[PDB]
Design a binder for this molecule. Structure first.
Ligand SMILES: N#C[C@@H](O)c1ccccc1
Ligand SMILES: N#C[C@@H](O)c1ccccc1
Lengths: 256, 256
C-alpha cells in the first residue's frame, strides 16, 4: 500500500536531513512531505521570534490543516520531532493514521510535556562544544542553542559520511528545546495524542539518545510496535536509509 | 602547496552546493571557506531586501575585508558566481591569488557588467518551469526568480544522484540575476578585476551553460588557463568532485 509520509526534522535541523529518505520512499510509490519547521532549514523566521514548541510546530499544524477531509498521513519524527508529533496529534488526531518515532523523544500523557526532555538531560548532560544564549519572548526567558561541531561529529553523525557531516555544519541553525515552556504547558491529551498508533524505531548504537534513555522511554509509555535497527547511528535516515524505508513500508501496510 | 579556497555558490543556491568538495579539499590539507551570499542558503535576509549584485555579494566582501594583511585566497565561483568574483576583485584584488571559474559566467572589462548575462539569455532563453516575480528596491524594479524543479532536474543536476537533486529541491531559494541593475553598473576595472589570474573550468556536457556559450566566453576574454573536465554536468562539484579537487590543487601549486 501507499501512504503520505510527513517527515519532521529535529531542533536545529531542517527538511534537508531527509534528503536521502524522501526519494527512496517516493521510489516505493509513496507521497512524501518534508517540512521546515519555524526558524528551521530555509524558513524565513529566526529563533528569537519563536516563543514555544507549539509556535515552533506551526508549519506542521498549518500543513495538517490544509489536508482535505478524509486524508490521513503517517507522521515520522526524528529526535525532538516526537514533541511536534504530540502537539500535532492534539489538534489533528483524525488526520493521523500513525506516528513513527525515529530515535525520538516519546512524550506521554501522565506527566508534564517536558518529562522526557528532563530525563534526556539527565542521561546526556554534556553537550560538548554546543553554545547557549538567551532571548526573551512573550515575557519568558528562553534558552537557545547552537549544536557544537564536535558534538555533531561524534554523537549525532557518528557514522555518517564526510559529505553528510558537512551539510550539518553548513545548515544547522540556532534553535531551542523550549524546555521551561514545555514544563508549564498543558499535558498532552489521552483523547488526541494518546489515541494515535505509535511506532518506535531506534538503534542501540545511538551516541546521544543512549540505550538507557530509549529503553526507559519504551517502558514509560508502551509503543504499539517497536523496531530495533541494527548498527547505524542517531541519524538512521542517513546511515540506514534503506532499513528505515523498509520499516515505513510495513507501517504503511499496517496502519491507515 | 596549501591554499585558502573561498567557494562561491550561484544564485538561488547556498554554501551547501559545496558539501562534497569542501571536505575533499580539506583532506588535501587546504583551508576552505564556503559562504552563503545575501538571502542565500541560511542567510537571514530575503531577496526582496537586496537591490543589486553588489549587495548580494556582501558576505564575500565582508569576508575578504576580515583577512589580515598579507593573506591571499583563491576564489572559486560556480555559474553566476563569476560576477561575485569580479565585484570582489575590484575591491580586494591584492587579497586574491587567483580566481577559478566553475562552469561560470566570465565578466570582462571592455563591456557592461551584464554583457555575458545578456549573452547567456540569448543562448538559453527557455528556463522551463522556472517562475518569476517582481519587487522594488531603491527605486528599481527587480526581477526575481525561483528555479523550476524540472529545469533543476534536467539542466542543472542532469547527472547528479537523487539525493543531491533532493537537496536542490529542498534548499534552492528565490533569487535574482539583477540583470537590469548590472546593465547600469560601472564597468569592472582593468586594474582590479582585470589584473587577477583567471582559471576557466568547464565541461561540454553542461546542459544550461552550453558549449556555444562557454566557448564564446573563452574567446571573448582569454583566461590565463583553461581546464576542460570530461563528462559530468553543470554541477561538477557534485558529479566530478575529485576532478575539481585535482584541478584546484594544481591551481594552488601554480598561483600564490
Ligand atoms: N540530532 C539532534 C538534536 O535533536 C539533538 C542535539 C543535541 C542533543 C540532543 C538532540
Ligand atoms: N545552477 C545554477 C544557476 O546559476 C542558474 C539557474 C538557471 C539558469 C542559469 C543558471
Amino acid at each position: 500500500a501507499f501512504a503520505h509520509f510527513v517527515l519532521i526534522h529535529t531542533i536545529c535541523h531542517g527538511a534537508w536531513i531527509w534528503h536521502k529518505l524522501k526519494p527512496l520512499l517516493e521510489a516505493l510509490g509513496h507521497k512524501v512531505t518534508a517540512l521546515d519547521l519555524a526558524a528551521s532549514g530555509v524558513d524565513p523566521r529566526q529563533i528569537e521570534e519563536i516563543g514555544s514548541f507549539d509556535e515552533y510546530s506551526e508549519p506542521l499544524l498549518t500543513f495538517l490543516e490544509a489536508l482535505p477531509p478524509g486524508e490521513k498521513v503517517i507522521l515520522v519524527g526524528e529526535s525532538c520531532g516526537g514533541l511536534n508529533i504530540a502537539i500535532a496529534a492534539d489538534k489533528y488526531c483524525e488526520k493521523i493514521a500513525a506516528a513513527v518515532f525515529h530515535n525520538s523523544v516519546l512524550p506521554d500523557t501522565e506527566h508534564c510535556p517536558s518529562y522526557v526532555v528532563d530525563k534526556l538531560m539527565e542521561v546526556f548532560p554534556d553537550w560538548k562544544d554546543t553554545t547557549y544564549f538567551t532571548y526573551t519572548k512573550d515575557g519568558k526567558e528562553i534558552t537557545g542553542l547552537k549544536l557544537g561541531f564536535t558534538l555533531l561529529r561524534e554523537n549525532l553523525y557518528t557514522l555518517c559520511g564526510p559529505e553528510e557531516y558537512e551539510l550539518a555544519k553548513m545548515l544547522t541553525r540556532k534553535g531551542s528545546l523550549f524546555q521551561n515552556i514545555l514544563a508549564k504547558r498543558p499535558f498532552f491529551t489521552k483523547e488526541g495524542y494518546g489515541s494515535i498508533k505509535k511506532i518506535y524505531v531506534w538503534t542501540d548504537q545511538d551516541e546521544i539518545f543512549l540505550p538507557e534513555f530509549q529503553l526507559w522511554q519504551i517502558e514509560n509509555y508502551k509503543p504499539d510496535k517497536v523496531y530495533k535497527v541494527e548498527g547505524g547511528d542517531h541519524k538512521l535516515q542517513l546511515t540506514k536509509t534503506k532499513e528505515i524505508a523498509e520499516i515505513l513500508q510495513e507501517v504503511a501496510d499496517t496502519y491507515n
